[PDB]
Amino acid sequence: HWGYGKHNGPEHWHKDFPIAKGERQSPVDIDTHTAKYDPSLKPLSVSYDQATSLRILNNGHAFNVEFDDSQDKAVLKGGPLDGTYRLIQFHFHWGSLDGQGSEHTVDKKKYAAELHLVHWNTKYGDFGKAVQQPDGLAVLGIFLKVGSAKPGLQKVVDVLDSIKTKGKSADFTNFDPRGLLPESLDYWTYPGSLTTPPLLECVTWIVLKEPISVSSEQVLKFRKLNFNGEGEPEELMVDNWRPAQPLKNRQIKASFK
Numbered sequence: 466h467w468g469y470g471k472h473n474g475p476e477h478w479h480k481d482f483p484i485a486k487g488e489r490q491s492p493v494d495i496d497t498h499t500a501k502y503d504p505s506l507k508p509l510s511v512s513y514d515q516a517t518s519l520r521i522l523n524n525g526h527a528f529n530v531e532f533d534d535s536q537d538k539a540v541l542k543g544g545p546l547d548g549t550y551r552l553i554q555f556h557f558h559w560g561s562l563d564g565q566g567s568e569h570t571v572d573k574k575k576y577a578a579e580l581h582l583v584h585w586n587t588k589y590g591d592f593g594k595a596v597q598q599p600d601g602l603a604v605l606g607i608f609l610k611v612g613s614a615k616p617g618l619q620k621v622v623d624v625l626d627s628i629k630t631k632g633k634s635a636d637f638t639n640f641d642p643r644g645l646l647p648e649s650l651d652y653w654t655y656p657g658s659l660t661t662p663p664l665l666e667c668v669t670w671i672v673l674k675e676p677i678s679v680s681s682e683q684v685l686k687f688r689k690l691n692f693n694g695e696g697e698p699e700e701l702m703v704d705n706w707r708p709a710q711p712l713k714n715r716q717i718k719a720s721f722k
């Protein structure tokens with residue numbers, strides 16, 4: 466099955482998922498000097514006050530913090546988006562060392578990690594239908610750098626020991642994702658894809674310019690997770706990022722001057 470090793474990693478994915486070589490793949494490098502300021506872009510509206518987290522799951526590739534998406538409770542709108550996108554889950558991608566881990570890059574800079582808040586367009590009724598549409602998902606991407614601790618992340622960090630291995634989950638209620646946001650909602654946006662198989666070309670990407678800071682100790686705990694299942698040979702869950710893909714016939718737009 467696909468993963469992030471030598472034998473099953475990103476360079477192999479195209480064999481099972483030929484869209485890996487498609488026209489709107491993610492992530493990409495954001496060349497800051499080429500991205501054009503678009504004064505028509507709106508402020509992003511992030512409405513997470515009623516977000517209801519339920520559970521955290523180690524799926525063998527990352528961990529997902531899952532939300533109740535059976536009503537409009539936590540939604541993303543505005544920015545480049547038409548209509549309303551409901552939060553379903555967030556997860557991260559990270560490295561074995563602080564010098565790599567992000568999926569998007571900024572002028573070729575790699576951050577230590579990248580947070581993805583995944584939302585689906587309510588006009589398609591369910592997530593599985595949304596991923597079949599070119600405007601089905603909106604993913605809000607946030608870079609992580611290592612420095613000061615992020616207090617709002619610590620609840621996530623502290624539950625990771627209970628979901629060490631693939632297929633483990635834990636109750637994870639009352640977690641407030643507002644504590645993971647940077648001060649500024651300035652962003653870049655472009656049309657792209659899921660960064661994991663099946664690599665579907667269904668995503669409007671919204672990547673915040675301002676990173677969040679997390680501590681070395683926080684990211685070190687991400688790196689103690691396992692890709693393997695319980696009792697199997699330990700493979701640390703590190704370097705679970707896809708590298709930048711060709712931009713092809715796409716424009717990255719900036720919300721800010």
Ligand SMILES: [N]S(=O)(=O)[C][C][C][C][C][C]C1234B567B89%10B%11%12%13B85%14B%1158B%12%11%15B%139%12B%1061B%12%112C5%153B%14874
Pocket residue numbers: 581583593596604658659660661662663
């Ligand atoms: N890293 S990222 O933020 O670009 C991607 C986040 C969303 C990935 C969704 C994957 C599937 B869900 B539905 B089905 B189940 B199985 B098939 B279909 B969607 B694709 C897979 B699972």
Ligand SMILES: [Zn+2]
Pocket residue numbers: 556557558581660
């Ligand atoms: Zn992701």
